[PDB]
């Protein structure tokens, strides 16, 4: 539908070619749990509707019979960035109402949740124009969910339900990234160490196990794989950690996870094989 | 009602000038900018699974906390924040061992505050170091 606005006489200037916009209707009654606050002030907009718009400071007056869109409500008008995602599956996503964290601030949202016929969802999430300068070819961003974390338990943000996690970087600017699974994340960081490990058995050592350095948590299994040729893993050393493990350094099954035994120097493998306990592979340099 | 406030902040008054700007401690690294605090480093070859919300132990009582746990070619290093009531008790070559969590103090008499302390095994290679 096309409406015809008719700005009064007084008040041309306001209308700039860059304006936007957005309907004022009705009510808006939302609840919440501990935040479930309705608040009414405009009482025409409640009976027979209402448009707002706003005015930007550097662009020209519109001229007569200019055309705009009219937007759903304030927030759909929003200014900033449109990035697109190419996420794995939309499971606890939403239209809108998801938000892209930045160390707890929401710094924008998604807005669109498509599916594209080659069964791969994409998403647009529109981006506060104060975090485009993060955006760079570094910068992942990365699906969360809410962890009970019984000290804190978080009960506001386990209503939540799954956001999104900026992680800035370097590099020339993006606008279309590939939101990580999550805990296939790590993986995809800038600098990590990617493994080989090949066992007869499994171990027990699942995808989430750790890998222990001295006592330390210092990288992840990600991947268990069945082969003929016996279990094989993938591991993510993190890049803090990363010129620690130098090559001839042995891995143990830790008795979870995979316990490393670093060595001096030396080149990184291609695939090292997952020892059982320290009697096996201490042997092997002996 | 208050797992439903979600997060407060708490105001420990103290002494000095008068300030307008602060600085909100993490919650957890807090006990680290008290006035008064021993802040400890350990050096270890491994870490015996002490971690950083992890104890002290001295005579049995509570009396700091392991800070963060810090991985190194040099091995494991701890830091670690004694409370100011019980600043006193630890005074030198008081020794430190992987209690059993958390690190277990042997207190030791007179002598002076080191830079860092290693963090035995357990006490039979604390105490034969002395003999």
């Given at each position: 539908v096309v409406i015809d606005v008719l700005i009064e006489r007084r008040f041309t200037?306001?209308?700039?070619?860059?304006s936007r916009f957005w309907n004022v209707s009705g009510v808006d009654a939302n609840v919440s749990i501990s935040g479930a606050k309705v608040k009414l002030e405009s009482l025409a907009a409640l009976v027979n509707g209402a448009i707002a718009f706003d005015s930007p400071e550097e662009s020209k007056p519109a001229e007569a019979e200019d055309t705009f869109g009219l937007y759903e409500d304030l927030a759909h008008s929003q200014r900033g960035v449109i990035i697109k995602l190419e996420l794995?599956?939309?499971?606890?996503?939403?239209?809108?109402?998801t938000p892209l964290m930045y160390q707890g601030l929401e710094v924008g949202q998604l807005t669109k949740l498509d599916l594209n016929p080659g069964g791969k969802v994409t998403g647009e999430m529109t981006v506060d124009?104060?975090?485009?300068?993060?955006?760079?070819?570094n910068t992942r961003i990365e699906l969360r969910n809410p962890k009970?974390?019984?000290?804190?338990?978080n009960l506001s943000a386990l209503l939540t339900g799954k956001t999104f996690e900026l992680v800035p970087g370097d590099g020339e600017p993006r606008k279309e990234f590939v939101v990580v699974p999550g805990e296939k994340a790590?993986?995809?960081?800038?600098?990590v160490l990617t493994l080989t490990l090949t066992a007869?058995?499994?171990?027990?050592?699942?995808?989430g196990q750790p890998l222990i350095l001295h006592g330390v948590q210092v990288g992840q299994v990600i991947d268990r794989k069945l082969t003929s040729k016996g279990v094989t893993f993938t591991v993510a050393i993190e890049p803090q950690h990363r010129?620690?493990?130098?090559?001839?350094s042995k891995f143990v099954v830790n008795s979870g996870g995979i316990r490393i035994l670093p060595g001096d120097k030396g080149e990184m493998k291609a695939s090292y094989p997952l020892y059982a306990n320290l009697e096996k592979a201490l042997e092997n340099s002996l």
């Open positions: 200037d306001l209308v700039k070619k860059g794995p599956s939309g499971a606890g996503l939403t239209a809108d109402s124009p104060s975090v485009v300068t993060l955006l760079r070819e009970l974390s019984l000290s804190d338990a790590l993986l995809h960081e800038p600098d007869p058995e499994s171990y027990g050592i699942d995808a010129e620690l493990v130098k090559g001839d």
